[PDB]
């Protein structure tokens, strides 16, 4: 506690959360992004909105937040308020009517190597096309396009943690079964700028309805 108090005071005495945490402005901050789907809260076919409970793990190295553990009694990791540090501004591009960005600023785990792990919770109300023709026996391919809103791919590169979303903590929905899921990183190019790519990670879930209820109560 005494060691960690000293450490936190010394880390944040001159920290700036405005500029990117690189040593050289020509370097790219590389952010690993992992989506954990905790619960599929709702599907709204009328307004075409999918409500999901997620944990959005982000990992990156902050150059200025290194320390030597032997200076601080063997403290190898600390927990700090995430409002103090620079963070990537991941935005849900296909937000329907929820929050575009993270709003629950939980604690960041910071390691002596400067590696930061942040795992904020979120509720995503994404917008996706709903195909109702076969209802109730339909299946929906609905997606979440995540990307840095104001940084382009030449200054902050985002990489998916795994080719699939994390479903280990997923609570079983009572009306929809996730047939499959997958995350793809994309790198769009524009006619202004042959050099700078624009990056996004689109997670998608193919979910199938459990029709039994509509069989009993309607059919």
């Amino acid at each position, epitope marked *: 506690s*005494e*060691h960690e108090t*000293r*450490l936190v005071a*010394k*880390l944040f*005495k*001159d*920290y700036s959360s405005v500029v990117r945490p690189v040593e050289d402005h020509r370097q790219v901050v590389e952010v690993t992004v992992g989506l954990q789907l905790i619960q599929l809260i709702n599907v709204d076919e009328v307004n075409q909105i999918v409500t999901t409970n997620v944990r959005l793990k982000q990992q990156w190295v902050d150059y*200025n*937040l*290194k*320390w*030597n*553990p*032997d*200076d*601080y*009694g*063997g403290v190898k990791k600390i927990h700090i308020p995430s409002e103090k540090i620079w963070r990537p501004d991941l935005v849900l591009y296909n937000n329907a009517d929820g929050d575009f960005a993270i709003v629950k600023f939980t604690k960041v785990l910071l390691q*002596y190597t400067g590696h930061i792990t942040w795992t904020p919770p979120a509720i995503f109300k994404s917008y996706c096309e709903i195909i109702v023709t076969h209802f109730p026996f339909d299946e929906q391919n609905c997606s979440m396009k995540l990307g840095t809103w104001t940084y382009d791919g030449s200054v902050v590169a985002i990489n998916p943690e795994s080719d699939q979303p994390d479903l280990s903590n997923f609570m079983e929905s009572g009306e929809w079964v996730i047939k499959e899921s997958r995350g793809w990183k994309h790198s769009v190019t524009y006619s202004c700028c042959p050099d700078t790519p624009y990056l996004d990670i689109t997670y998608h879930f193919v979910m199938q309805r459990l029709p039994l209820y509509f069989i009993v109560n309607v059919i």
Partner: antibody, heavy 120, light 107 residues
Framework: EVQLQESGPGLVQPSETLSLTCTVS????????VSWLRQPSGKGPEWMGR???????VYNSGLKSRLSISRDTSKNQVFLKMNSLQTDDTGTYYC??????????????WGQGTLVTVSS | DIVITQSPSLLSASVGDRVTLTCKGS??????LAWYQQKLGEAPKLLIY???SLQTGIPSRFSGSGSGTDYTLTISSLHSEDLATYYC????????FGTGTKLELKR
């Protein structure tokens, strides 16, 4: 400008205590950390501990139980007391002034070093 | 902690020669390497820190370089005053020092 006069007894008996004093000139202990290095005879240097500018201390984990470091800002002195001395503790002792960048420290200035020999 | 080795252990050189000393770690030191010079009966003096930054007031002869686990210190033109022991050390995970390189006059 910066000077660190390390001093103390040359010969020490086993199992008794050793006292060393580093007197600082050219800077204030309230704004620079001081650290103690040891160079055993026939071996490379090793770091023992640091007196922080804020008045705290930290020690090498292997020497945590045997070492005490303290300071007096009124006359710019830093003191090292060590117990349970053995023949293996013979060597040259340096006090150093440390630079910082954020939470990273390195040894920037050294004292002239005092030879301490443990013998009977 | 990171183990450090220095080479050569002794180096015979003549005044005016360019000379290079090598320091190698057991793990990535991430440029947190420093070089300091020691003479007999003299207080150690820091030469280089963070692999490149000259200590204030040090002659421009000394220049450092390296990456990963391998680092070097170079003297462009060896003066007679530079015959001494050179230590590399790291300050990123613990504090560990090399065995020293004793740069000595050719004969």
């Amino acid at each position: 400008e910066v000077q660190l006069q390390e001093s103390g007894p040359g010969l020490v008996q086993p199992s008794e205590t050793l006292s060393l004093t580093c007197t600082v000139s050219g800077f204030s202990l309230t704004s620079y950390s001081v650290s103690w290095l040891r160079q055993p005879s026939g071996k490379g240097p090793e770091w023992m501990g640091r007196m922080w500018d804020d008045g705290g201390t930290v020690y090498n984990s292997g020497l945590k139980s045997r070492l005490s470091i303290s300071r007096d800002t009124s006359k710019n002195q830093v003191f090292l007391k060590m117990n349970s001395l053995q023949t293996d503790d013979t060597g040259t002792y340096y006090c150093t002034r440390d630079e910082r960048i954020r939470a990273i420290n390195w040894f920037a200035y050294w004292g002239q070093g005092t030879l301490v020999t443990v013998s009977s | 902690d990171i183990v450090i080795t220095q080479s050569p252990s002794l180096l015979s050189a003549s005044v005016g020669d360019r000379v290079t000393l090598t320091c190698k770690g057991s793990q990535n030191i991430d440029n947190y390497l420093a070089w300091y010079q020691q003479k007999l009966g003299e207080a150690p003096k820091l030469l280089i820190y963070k692999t490149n930054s000259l200590q204030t007031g040090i002659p421009s002869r000394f220049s450092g370089s390296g990456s990963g686990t391998d680092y070097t210190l170079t003297i462009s033109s060896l003066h007679s005053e530079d015959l001494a022991t050179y230590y590399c050390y790291q300050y990123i995970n613990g504090y560990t020092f090399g065995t020293g390189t004793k740069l000595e006059l050719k004969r």
